[PDB]
Design an enzyme around this catalytic site. Structure first.
Site, PDB file in Angstrom:
ATOM      1  N   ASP A 398       0.808  -1.220   0.000  1.00  0.00           N
ATOM      2  CA  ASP A 398       0.000   0.000   0.000  1.00  0.00           C
ATOM      3  C   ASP A 398       0.838   1.264   0.000  1.00  0.00           C
ATOM      4  O   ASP A 398       2.063   1.239   0.154  1.00  0.00           O
ATOM      5  CB  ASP A 398      -0.891  -0.031   1.246  1.00  0.00           C
ATOM      6  CG  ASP A 398      -2.161   0.808   1.145  1.00  0.00           C
ATOM      7  OD1 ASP A 398      -2.475   1.384   0.080  1.00  0.00           O
ATOM      8  OD2 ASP A 398      -2.877   0.813   2.164  1.00  0.00           O
ATOM      9  N   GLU A 401       1.721   7.298  -2.523  1.00  0.00           N
ATOM     10  CA  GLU A 401       1.168   8.537  -3.091  1.00  0.00           C
ATOM     11  C   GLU A 401       1.263   9.754  -2.163  1.00  0.00           C
ATOM     12  O   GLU A 401       0.824  10.873  -2.533  1.00  0.00           O
ATOM     13  CB  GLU A 401      -0.322   8.317  -3.478  1.00  0.00           C
ATOM     14  CG  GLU A 401      -1.323   8.382  -2.336  1.00  0.00           C
ATOM     15  CD  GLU A 401      -1.414   7.095  -1.525  1.00  0.00           C
ATOM     16  OE1 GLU A 401      -0.730   6.126  -1.876  1.00  0.00           O
ATOM     17  OE2 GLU A 401      -2.177   7.056  -0.525  1.00  0.00           O
ATOM     18  N   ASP A 465      -9.395   2.646  -3.273  1.00  0.00           N
ATOM     19  CA  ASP A 465     -10.574   2.821  -2.447  1.00  0.00           C
ATOM     20  C   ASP A 465     -11.769   3.276  -3.291  1.00  0.00           C
ATOM     21  O   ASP A 465     -11.807   4.426  -3.650  1.00  0.00           O
ATOM     22  CB  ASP A 465     -10.294   3.905  -1.340  1.00  0.00           C
ATOM     23  CG  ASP A 465      -9.607   5.267  -1.902  1.00  0.00           C
ATOM     24  OD1 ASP A 465      -8.335   5.172  -2.248  1.00  0.00           O
ATOM     25  OD2 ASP A 465     -10.385   6.397  -1.961  1.00  0.00           O
TER      26      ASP A 465
HETATM   27 CA   LIG Z   1     -12.327   6.802  -3.563  1.00  0.00          CA
END
Ligand SMILES: [Ca+2]
Length: 674
Positions: A398, A401, A465
């Site tokens: 993960d 960013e 997500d």
């Molecule tokens: Ca999203």
């Protein structure tokens, strides 16, 4: 040809490259402006607000040519204290190479125009969730949080904005990239990693803004899109073949320890679900915050949560079930690894010279300095020793960013430049852990953040997500443009969380949504669930018998497709031909295919148009001219727009009657109806 024609009399020119008009420049219509600005950055814990304080913007209307060894050198200027050069040449493989260099560092803005035609479509720029065709809009390219809602006209976006500027917008992504494909059948790739803005809104030109004093761009043409992707992937990288076990069923996302994993595994397997794995992101512990439960950010098995996991993995493995974990490139400040890292100067620094600590909501994380050669090797050793040697078949790798823009890094390069380069660097760390242990083709990691290079180093992309909703901009639908944009940027392995993820502001995953998303992911190269950030608010894969039976149906569908998926994945690895394919790769002469966003080809022979709205009993989609067979009825279909019955379990899926795999596809109906 590399066809460059200057006219010194009036400082004007054109550049064609294999017949494509790339540059035009005259005194009244320049192609180059330079200037300067000051980045005005508010991080908002990764939900970046990034605006320019622009100081100057100057058209360089004067141009003189001279000839270098490899080709042409243009000296652009405007009076004597404002100038830049452009070198035009061809690189070792025959790609058009453009090298821009401004007079000095203080000129830290560039605007370059490229000729375009009104009818051109534009694809790529990494992973894009609201648009696939980019033509008509501008696209800032700054890796960030992806947004919650992502549309200023939807309620959840407004709520998320009120909380931490977290709503986002149409262009927000954790994997932007300065690379695109035109329907003049070229790609353009920019080497730089500074903030960029690629504006495809004007009918006659594309405008590329860079926040730096220099730029390098490369172009290459081809006769087909397939060939164009072969060539792009030769420049950027090709992914490996996936391990054989990916195709053997669904990976269950589960939290709560060994017992809880075993139980749910057994419940699903006993009801006939094909299960290839367990993904348990709390393998390292749980942290309680006021903001809710979290994973403990210290990448070491927690035997108090996961007793006997070492030995249980072996047993799961002996029954065809992998175990997959979780890591990210920060280390919790209150725990072992961050302690060891501070002691060896493995962390990024702040301005005061201390170790940088990122606030995450009631805990801090140190930033592992991947530009420090020995921090990089140390973190790679953490993955080897604490994950690979533990018997993990894979993990979510993960983040990437949210490198803060006021960190100070070991290599001395501004964090305003390293920020966009962070994700592929994080990918390479993972990739090399596998390389160094002989585990490529056997272990699978998956990522959300990406950058130039992820095409080589990330073994699988995940769409990050989504909301647990039916919205276009952050729902089930948004995954399709994400896969197709990435396909066009040279990454052809893509999946999403079955059921989506983000559960905030009264959003709750329904049974219907889980089941529709199950139907979608059965037609992608990987099936994996996720509990969501609030597990008890969402319908889960074992919520009732009907739900379990649905997973049994759809994992049977997915495992039956195995040898067809495996050939597609081999083709991806060999020549950059992606597994989820925009329709125009195989129907180049069908104009309507260039503007589709929410349907794709799975391999050559399967057309998929996932149901992405609540409460549907049918679905409308487009079929190009071919002999199509509906997967669940065997009904024959010709080209054109069509509406079909589409109850849950019978997604809008069609196959080519002339396919060499046609007998495998007819077996879906045959298997499920006995
Ligand atoms: Ca999203």
């Amino acid at each position: 040809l590399l066809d460059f024609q200057f006219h010194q009399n009036n400082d004007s020119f054109t550049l064609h490259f294999q017949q494509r008009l790339i540059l035009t420049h005259s005194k009244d219509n320049p192609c180059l402006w330079i200037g300067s600005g000051i980045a005005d950055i508010d991080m908002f814990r990764g939900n970046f607000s990034i605006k320019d304080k622009l100081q100057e913007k100057i058209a360089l209307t004067d141009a003189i040519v001279s000839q270098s060894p490899d080709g042409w050198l243009i000296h652009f200027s405007r009076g004597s204290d404002i100038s830049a050069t452009l070198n035009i040449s061809a690189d070792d493989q025959g790609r058009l190479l453009l090298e821009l260099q401004n007079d000095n560092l203080n000129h830290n803005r560039i605007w370059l125009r490229l000729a375009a035609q009104p009818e051109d479509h534009i694809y790529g720029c990494g992973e894009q969730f609201s648009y696939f065709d980019l033509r008509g809009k501008p696209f800032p390219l700054w890796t960030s949080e992806q947004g919650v809602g992502r549309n200023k006209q939807t309620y959840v976006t407004w709520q998320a904005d009120c909380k931490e500027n977290a709503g986002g917008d149409y262009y927000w992504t954790f994997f932007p990239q300065p690379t695109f494909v035109s329907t003049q059948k070229y790609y353009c790739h920019v080497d730089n990693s500074c903030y960029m803005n690629f504006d495809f809104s004007a009918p006659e030109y594309h405008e590329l803004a860079l926040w730096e004093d220099k730029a390098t761009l490369r172009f290459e043409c081809a006769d087909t899109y397939i060939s164009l992707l072969e060539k792009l992937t030769a420049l950027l990288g090709r992914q490996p073949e996936l391990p054989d076990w990916i195709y053997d069923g669904v990976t269950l996302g589960i939290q709560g320890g060994t017992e809880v994993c075993q139980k749910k595994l057994d419940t699903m397997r006993n009801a006939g679900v094909k299960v290839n794995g367990i993904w348990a992101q709390d393998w390292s512990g749980i942290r309680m915050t006021s903001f809710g439960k979290r994973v403990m950010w210290n990448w070491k098995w927690n035997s108090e949560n996961y007793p006997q996991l070492d030995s249980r993995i072996k047993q799961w493995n002996q029954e065809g079930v992998q175990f997959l974990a979780y890591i990210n490139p920060y280390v919790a400040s209150d725990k072992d690894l961050c302690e060891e890292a501070a002691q060896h100067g493995y962390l990024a620094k702040d301005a005061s010279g201390g170790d940088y600590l990122v606030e995450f909501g009631e805990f801090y994380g140190g930033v592992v300095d991947l530009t420090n050669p020995e921090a990089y090797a140390w973190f790679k050793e953490v993955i080897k020793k604490n994950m690979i040697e533990l018997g993990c078949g894979g993990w979510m790798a993960d983040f990437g960013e949210y490198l803060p823009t006021d960190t100070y890094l070991h290599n001395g390069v501004s964090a305003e430049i390293m920020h966009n380069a962070w994700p592929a660097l994080w990918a390479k760390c993972n990739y090399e852990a596998l390389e160094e242990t002989g585990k490529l083709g056997e272990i699978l990691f998956f990522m959300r953040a990406g950058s130039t290079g992820s095409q080589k180093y990330s073994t699988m992309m995940w769409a990050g997500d989504q909301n647990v909703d039916w919205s276009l901009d952050d729902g089930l639908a948004s995954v399709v443009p994400a896969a197709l944009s990435l396909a066009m940027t040279g990454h052809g392995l893509h999946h999403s969380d079955i059921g989506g993820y983000t559960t905030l502001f009264e959003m709750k995953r329904s049974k219907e949504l889980l089941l529709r998303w199950c139907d979608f992911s059965a037609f992608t190269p990987m099936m994996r669930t996720h509990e969501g950030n609030r597990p008890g608010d969402n319908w889960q894969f074992d919520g009732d018998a009907e739900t379990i039976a649905h997973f049994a149906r759809m994992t049977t569908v997915f495992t039956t497709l195995k040898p067809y998926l495996k050939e597609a994945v081999a083709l991806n690895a060999k020549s950059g031909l992606p597994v989820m394919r925009p329709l125009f790769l195989h129907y180049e002469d069908d104009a309507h295919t260039y503007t589709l966003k929410y349907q794709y080809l799975l391999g050559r022979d399967i057309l998929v148009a996932p149901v992405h709205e609540e409460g549907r009993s049918d679905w409308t989609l487009y079929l190009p001219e071919d002999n199509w067979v509906h997967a669940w009825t065997g009904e024959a279909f010709r080209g054109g727009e069509v509406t079909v019955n589409a109850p849950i379990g019978k997604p809008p899926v069609f196959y080519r009657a002339d396919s060499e795999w046609a007998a495998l596809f007819a077996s879906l109906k045959s298997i499920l109806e006995h």
